[PDB]
């Protein structure tokens, strides 16, 4: 399968991947790209519905369970913000600080507005400041 000299690496891989997509699409969706399930962003997934809700974090709250809740189900921006463990800093990769901010300790009240609508979604953490 080595014949064409100086074929760009981008052109080979793309050519193979698209040849795969082309054979999956024909044999599992009768050549209909409208049948492909879309998401906002595709990645980060480890290989292992309320519009306005309120969570009360404890000093016993499970961190995974906590973050899964705060993220929600839908693939949107807040999904990434709570789940992604690394964020970018130009070309650098650093421990997601948002996960450190919201990290479940006793006294941490989370409210969510517009949970069903990403674009308007607003999380409002609340803590006892002076009492």
């Amino acid at each position: 399968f080595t014949k064409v000299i100086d074929e760009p690496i981008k052109s080979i891989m793309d050519g193979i991947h698209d040849g795969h997509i082309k054979k999956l699409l024909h044999q599992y969706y009768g050549d209909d790209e409208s049948k492909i399930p879309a998401v906002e962003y595709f990645g980060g997934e480890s290989p292992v519905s309320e519009d306005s809700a309120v969570f009360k974090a404890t000093s016993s709250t499970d961190e995974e369970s906590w973050f899964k809740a705060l993220a929600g189900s839908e693939i949107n921006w807040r999904h990434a913000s709570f789940l992604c463990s690394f964020i970018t800093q130009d070309k650098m990769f650093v421990s997601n600080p948002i996960r450190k901010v919201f990290k479940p300790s006793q006294g941490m009240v989370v409210e969510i507005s517009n949970g069903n609508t990403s674009s308007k979604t607003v999380v409002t953490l609340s803590e006892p400041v002076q009492g």
Partner: protein, 845 residues
């Protein structure tokens, strides 16, 4: 009003809330039971000594039930009904005793015999409390079957599973006396009569057939050889299989017609097939005792006539000593041959048949697997064939790790079976006529319309019910003459299988799990109660359990690892496999390649092209070389994009300067997505360090052979929450290659890789296009080798990218690579001898 009564054995105790009106009767048993109960010891490791409170309540129940009379009202009737109710409430939280016994095994320091006695006691109490299993069980399995989430099928083993089959019957008599004691009493009676009905049966039954006395008194039970004789072993195997069926029906509270109605279809292995049709008739508990009488009568008449058509003779001690020195086994009429294809063994039997006359010829009887067969014939002949095979097999300890795959001498196993008659042979044909005449004389005849569920014929795999002729005559022919083809007769699409045959974990069930491994079928060993650590198949508990435990689905590889499609907002279609999900890029990566992928200018290009590539360590011999290259890539790549580093395990210098460096650049947080350790898998200790300390997304590994693969699994088994990319390649790969075929080690391991969802499995070597990879992505590539579909999660291309423009290989080097034709997958193993499509194998330093 209640007066509490505590009963203890050393440290452990249990409190029962006896009522004060009948407390004098229970406080009379407190002392008398603690008299029967032995002395406390450390661990309670002594036999007949309760280890848990539940066991102590059990032994109480068993003692109380012993002294009570079921016919005559005693003072201890309400005392049994309150202590059993208390046991039921505290310990049996809905689940069957089988689920508790299973829970005690894997939790407490409880041996198997302690569960057997506990269940015996509890089932004696419940039945003898005048509280039979008359209510319907809420078993998740049979609830799901009614719903239509599962389709049960019953299989029934036969001969050659275990030598001491009788000991499976003995246990039942002891552990379920109250459930099957009547049926054993019936069969025992029936046989006692049948031998007086057959003119020359008693001649065969030299040491009698008093099976009741053999159960009661082990001393009276004859020598094991006499038991193994087919006139005794045939009917009794029926009775064991009927026993296990009956015990399951009662404890579920189903009638024999109800349980038969729940199964989609039944079938048996050789003489098991008679048991399969025995349950297909039965309707209620009343019409059952003629359906057994039928079955047992068939197994009586085959079992005797086959012994009078081919009686086992004395064998010269010269053969026995030779066979036991090679340590194959005692010669029998049935020789198992594992790990060989049907044509190969067919070859060898032709050669052995050629020498010998028709009266001493061997034939293939069983076809139990793809590489599992059994030959039948005279034990002289099969010994002579065992002689022929021993010259062809490699020695057991022979290392062919260095020999190229093709010329490695094939290694396999050949033991004789624990059986007395060559079933499915021309040698038992002469019994056929005397079997039929006897079956018609004793008024046994199965009617197609009387059969309710489809029974599958062992020969062709069709339903029995479609027969024009006698069903009995076909069944006889199928057992004595026609060869079983087990894969052919298991073509049905069930979700669960119930092995009621003898042997249990060494019985037909486990064999049929192996055959259908990865086809989404769960086998359950109904005959034996134990714990499988692997949890690939189930035991008795899964039948009876009512929780989510009872319903364990075996994974179907085609469905669970289907290659789906997806697309982000920007309409960029991905292929969405287990790999692609984590990395969020297509599942096509460029491996680590010295020197192709040492050049930053190519690694940065491919990472900007949208694909994952490993920067090869093998071009840089110092920390300062990595850092200069890393930073040269970093400065070229787009924001938020990452790449991998390949290292070499067989260069301990490059590891000892390169691992601490990666740890320092990743503690500062460079975009090093992952680490691959090519050429040799690391030890569990080093691998654990790499996983924890580095702080990477995942850890690629490039295992060479089976031993490596299993060492990878072990690494993943330790960190099940950390992804581990197993980049399996054949010898047919470019660069440092093993002697191993790309496919065959996956065929023999895939199953054991997919038991850990944290292992992303990537297949590399000999790939350059979509068309050649596709079969491996979909999983249809394994259909060529007659396995279930076995899809893969990724694909790495070593040689395909060498001719790419961004690669720093000299234009004339490209022209030389292009010039090379290559070869098909078959011929790659000729590289050792001469140039093969312009490529040859040489030795390193």
């Amino acid at each position: 009003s209640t007066r509490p009564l505590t009963l203890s054995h050393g440290s452990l105790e249990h409190v029962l809330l006896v009522p004060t009106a009948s407390f004098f009767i229970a406080s009379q048993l407190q002392e008398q039971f603690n008299k029967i109960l032995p002395e406390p010891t450390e661990g309670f490791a002594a036999d007949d000594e309760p280890t848990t409170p539940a066991e102590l309540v059990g032994k109480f129940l068993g003692y109380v039930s012993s002294l009570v009379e079921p016919s005559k009202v005693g003072q201890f009737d309400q005392v049994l009904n309150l202590c059993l109710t208390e046991f039921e409430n505290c310990y049996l939280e809905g689940n069957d005793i089988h689920a508790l016994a299973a829970k005690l095994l894997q939790e407490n320091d409880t041996t198997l015999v302690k569960t057997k006695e506990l269940i015996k006691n509890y089932i004696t109490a419940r039945i003898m409390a005048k509280r039979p299993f008359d209510k319907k069980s809420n078993s998740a399995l049979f609830r799901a079957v009614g719903e239509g989430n599962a389709q049960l099928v019953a299989i029934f083993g036969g001969q050659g599973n275990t030598d001491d089959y009788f000991e499976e019957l003995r246990d039942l008599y002891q552990t379920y006396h109250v459930l099957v004691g009547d049926l054993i009493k019936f069969s025992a009676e029936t046989l006692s009569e049948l031998i007086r009905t057959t003119l020359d049966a008693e001649k065969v039954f030299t040491q009698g057939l008093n099976i009741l006395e053999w159960l009661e008194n082990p001393s009276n039970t004859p020598d094991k050889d006499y038991l193994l004789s087919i006139p005794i072993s045939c009917p009794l195997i029926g009775v064991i299989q009927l026993a296990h069926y009956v015990v399951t029906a009662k404890l579920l509270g189903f009638t024999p017609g109800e349980l038969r109605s729940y199964l989609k279809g039944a079938t048996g292995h050789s003489q098991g097939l008679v048991t399969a049709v025995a349950i297909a008739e039965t309707d209620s508990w009343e019409s059952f005792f003629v359906s057994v009488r039928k079955a047992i009568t068939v197994l009586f008449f085959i079992g005797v006539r086959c012994y009078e058509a081919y009686p086992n003779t004395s064998l010269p001690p010269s053969i026995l000593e030779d066979s036991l020195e090679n340590n194959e086994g005692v010669p029998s009429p049935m020789l198992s041959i594992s790990n060989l294809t049907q044509e190969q063994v067919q070859d060898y039997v032709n050669k052995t048949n050629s020498h010998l006359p028709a009266g001493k010829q061997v034939e293939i009887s069983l076809v139990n697997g793809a590489k599992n067969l059994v030959v039948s014939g005279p034990p002289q002949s099969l010994y002579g064939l065992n002689l022929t095979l021993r010259k062809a097999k490699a020695p057991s300890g022979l290392d062919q790790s260095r020999i190229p795959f093709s010329e490695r001498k094939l290694k396999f196993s050949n033991r004789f079976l624990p059986v007395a008659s060559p079933f499915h042979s021309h040698l038992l044909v002469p019994a056929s006529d005397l079997i039929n005449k006897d079956l018609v004389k004793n008024n046994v005849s199965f009617n197609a319309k009387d059969i309710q569920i489809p029974v599958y014929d062992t020969f062709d795999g069709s339903d029995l019910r479609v027969l024009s002729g006698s069903i009995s005559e076909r069944i006889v022919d199928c057992i004595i003459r026609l060869p079983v083809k087990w894969e052919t007769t298991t073509q049905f699409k069930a979700t669960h299988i119930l092995d009621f045959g003898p042997g249990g974990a060494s019985g037909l069930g486990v064999l049929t799990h192996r055959n259908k491994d990865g086809t989404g079928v769960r086998v359950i060993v109904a005959g034996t109660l134990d714990i499988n650590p692997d949890d690939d198949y189930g035991f008795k508990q899964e039948i009876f359990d009512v929780t989510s435990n009872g319903l364990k689905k075996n994974p179907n590889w085609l469905e669970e690892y289907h290659p789906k499609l997806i697309k982000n907002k920007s309409g960029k279609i991905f292929v969405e496999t287990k790999f692609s999900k984590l990395i969020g890029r297509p599942p096509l990566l460029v491996p680590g390649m010295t020197p192709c992928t040492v050049s930053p200018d190519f690694v940065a290009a491919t990472t900007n092209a949208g694909y994952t590539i490993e920067l090869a360590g093998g071009g840089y011999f110092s920390a300062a070389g990595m850092t200069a290259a890393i930073d040269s890539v970093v400065s070229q790549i787009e924001k938020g994009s990452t790449f991998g580093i390949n290292l070499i395990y067989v260069n301990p210098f490059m590891l000892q300067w390169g691992i601490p460096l990666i740890k320092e650049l990743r503690s500062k947080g460079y975009p090093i997505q992952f680490l691959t350790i090519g050429a040799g898998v690391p030890s569990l200790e080093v691998a654990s360090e790499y996983i924890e300390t580095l702080g990477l997304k995942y850890l690629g590994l490039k295992p060479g052979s089976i031993d490596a693969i299993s060492q990878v699994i072990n690494i993943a088994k330790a960190h099940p929450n950390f992804p581990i990319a197993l980049q399996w390649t054949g010898g047919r790969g470019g660069g440092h290659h093993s002697f191993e075929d790309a496919h065959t080690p996956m065929l023999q391991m895939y199953s054991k890789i997919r038991r850990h969802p944290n292992i992303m499995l990537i297949f590399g070597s000999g790939f350059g296009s979509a068309d050649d990879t596709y079969p491996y992505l979909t999983g249809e590539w394994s259909t060529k080798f007659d396995y279930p579909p076995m899809p893969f999660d990724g694909f790495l291309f070593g040689s395909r990218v060498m001719i790419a423009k961004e690669v720093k290989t000299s234009p004339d080097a490209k022209k030389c690579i292009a010039a090379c034709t290559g070869v098909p997958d078959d011929k790659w193993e000729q590289t050792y001898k001469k140039p093969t499509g312009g490529i040859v194998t040489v030795r390193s330093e």
